């Protein structure tokens, strides 16, 4: 039993970095939050535009808690013309399926003017984020940081918090969706680093291009070790984060602490999080912070300006003249060999489920999973079906039923030919990356090459373009769990499926059943006169 501190980050009282947090949870306290989903106007980069925000800021307010705390988060939808539904990214929701926030799966949408109070315990610690999982809303700024304090696998003095990395349009994503769904995502007008960037409005005739955008700035005190919590939250952005003339000691991936490793740059797919410790041991100077936008992965109009500024002297106003490390320049994830959980777990005996991604064109460009593109009915979410004792779901719900062989290995194959590295997010579980391969899956040979012995473990991992991703998870969380590409266009285009896991073992408190019913009653009251119908997959 030791206290967490700058020289004992492994400690968490009677618990520690060695505690199995899948099986053991500290007692904490209840923390209550009130969030308002708003229709806003912001100027993050000297361009004024609309946004959909929590509480009028991009990013939204920080939700900060300790490992074990119970969170009560009242979410009121103050948009006029969209439902909304908020997901707590990577959060296991063991026994709280109905608060996972996936509209069409775990809830009906929150109708305009309605409130839904999300309740869940945090049985994980580290860096994550919360965001709307209702259509493309997070692309208009509807996300915020969710930081759960706990132990760490390397010592550090100061936690600077999250640095968000994203693309950023100069108009609502909902304005460009009709063009994007023809099949080619647009190059967006800029990027943001923790909510800010420069933009040259000097030659603009657009009255909204008011200028004054500023670089993200981070100040170091020489000798201090800083925890930076990196999240890629773009619509369709890949990053390779780096700080010139500094080394990153990587200590967590998503919500899983790893054996520290050092790296000059850090590949980060959408929805992925890393925790790094940077020691401020360079010559004191201004250094460029590089997002290293992956131009081979997706387009942006201003890729080279996905940068911020590290200062050792905060009174300096000069731009860095530092020289960047040459990026690997791929759309890959960090190498599997680098991502070794500190808490070592092995994958047990399993049953294999194989699915294949392709594309089709119906009304617009769609992605298919075993020939079916996800299309959900917001007024009949999977959980509603489950509470009605339905076990056969619509084809377009892309349900795979799991029932106990205590483990599943889920192989998803890219048969599209496109060579996109798709960030695949699984809800309700950390998975084990048993293979992440650039090659064709062979059901007779590939399983023999799976790594079942402490493989990487996280909640978002790349399906390699033209390859396969084999992820294992244990049947330990009855529910209906969405799995999808986190490239927002692709999710909206149906690149998703869901696991209905141990359906008959789902338990929901009567109070939460009543709440769920109320949410859907209110949604159903809104839809007859909504201005805008569902026009994508729902998620
Ligand atoms: C959620 O609310 C947003 C409003 O904030 C809705 O966005 C609207 O979406 C419609 C349908 O896609 C857009 O119409 C299209 O606009 C483009 C661009 O001018 C045009 O080329 C198309 O032919 C079509 O008219 C509309 O622009 C857009 N409105 C705004 C202000 O962005 C969205 O549909 C809502 N979704 C739900 C599910 O309630
Ligand atoms: C990126 O932008 C956000 C601001 O949009 C910064 O978020 C800030 O993060 C820090 C550290 O995690 C938060 O500090 C904590 O505040 C709470 C509540 O009062 C307190 O309990 C803790 O002791 C700690 O001071 C801070 O709340 C938060 N600010 C906002 C507005 O949410 C973040 O720091 C930026 N990243 C960098 C590297 O600058
Ligand atoms: C968010 O905004 C709403 C509406 O004004 C308010 O009730 C709530 O307290 C605010 N929450 C935070 C965290 O500021
Ligand atoms: C947000 O406000 C804008 C400007 O009034 C409006 O055009 C748009 O429909 C609103 N969006 C939603 C989702 O309510
Ligand atoms: C998806 O299709 C492939 C190829 O036909 C088949 O091998 C696999 O079992 C299918 N998966 C499921 C879950 O239906
Ligand atoms: C679902 O099954 C349970 C268990 O038998 C039963 O109590 C409940 O009423 C059922 N509900 C419906 C709507 O079929
Ligand atoms: C993470 O660790 C692996 C194995 O040592 C390296 O191959 C990689 O480049 C990174 O350091
Ligand atoms: Cu997410
Ligand atoms: Cu994708
Ligand atoms: Cu998701």
Author numbering: 1 to 404, 409 to 543
Quote the study's own text.
Laccases are members of a large family of multicopper oxidases that catalyze the oxidation of a wide range of organic and inorganic substrates accompanied by the reduction of dioxygen to water. These enzymes contain four Cu atoms per molecule organized into three sites: T1, T2 and T3. The substrate oxidation takes place at the T1 site and molecular oxygen is reduced to water at the T2/T3 site. In this work, the laccase from the ascomycete Botrytis aclada was studied, which contains conserved Ile491 and nonconserved Leu499 residues in the axial positions.
In the present study, we prepared the L499M mutant of the laccase from B. aclada, in which the nonconserved leucine residue in the axial position of the T1 site was replaced by a methionine. The overall structure of L499M BaL is similar to that of BaL and can be superimposed with a Cα r.m.s.d. of 0.10 Å. A comparison of the structures of BaL and L499M BaL shows that there are no changes in the structure of the enzyme except for the region near the axial mutation. In BaL, as in most of the known laccases, the Cu1 ion lies in the plane formed by the coordinated atoms of histidine and cysteine residues. In the T1 site of L499M BaL, Cu1 is displaced from this plane towards the Sδ atom of Met499 by 0.17 Å. In the L499M BaL structure the distance between Cu1 and the Sδ atom of Met499 is 3.2 Å, which also can be ascribed to a weak coordination bond. Hence, the 140 mV decrease in the redox potential of L499M BaL can be attributed exclusively to the mutation. The specific activity of L499M BaL towards ABTS was lower than that of BaL over the whole pH range and was lower for 2,6-DMP at pH < 5, which is consistent with the lower potential of the T1 site of L499M BaL. However, in the pH range 5–7 L499M BaL showed a higher activity than BaL.
